[PDB]
Ligand binder design. Structure first.
Ligand code: K
Ligand code: K
Ligand code: K
Ligand code: MG
Ligand code: MG
Ligand code: MG
Ligand code: MG
Ligand code: MG
Length: 44
RNA sequence: AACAUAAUUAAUUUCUAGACAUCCGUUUAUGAGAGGAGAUAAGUCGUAACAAGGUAAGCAUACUGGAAAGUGUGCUUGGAAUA
């Protein structure tokens, strides 16, 4: 078990960084659609 | 009235809401009362037509009359025409 903890903890740090990047993408995509929504109302 | 969410399998939602009510008219039935035509069928009043029907007849039209009918004007023969 001691050896597995080191391996699992290393993967855990990688997952945290992967999750952080994916979360930022969702936040950015949300901002763009909301900005477009304003333009759509301006056209409407 | 027609947008908005969502999106590291992908989908959700919108994609509406009133007013289609009277009609203006148009047909038919009802018929106060007033007429017509026809038939019923013994009658009444005249004798208008058919004979040159006893005023030759008729047409259009006008007027007149119990009723057929009478009179005028033009027209027709589906009348006559030698004294
Ligand atoms: K006569
Ligand atoms: K007569
Ligand atoms: K005659
Ligand atoms: Mg006569
Ligand atoms: Mg006579
Ligand atoms: Mg006459
Ligand atoms: Mg007279
Ligand atoms: Mg006279």
């Amino acid at each position: 078990l001691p050896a597995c903890e080191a391996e699992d903890l290393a993967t855990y740090e990688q997952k945290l960084r992967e999750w952080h990047l994916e979360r930022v993408q969702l936040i950015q995509r949300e901002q763009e659609q909301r900005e477009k929504a304003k333009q759509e109302y301006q056209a409407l």
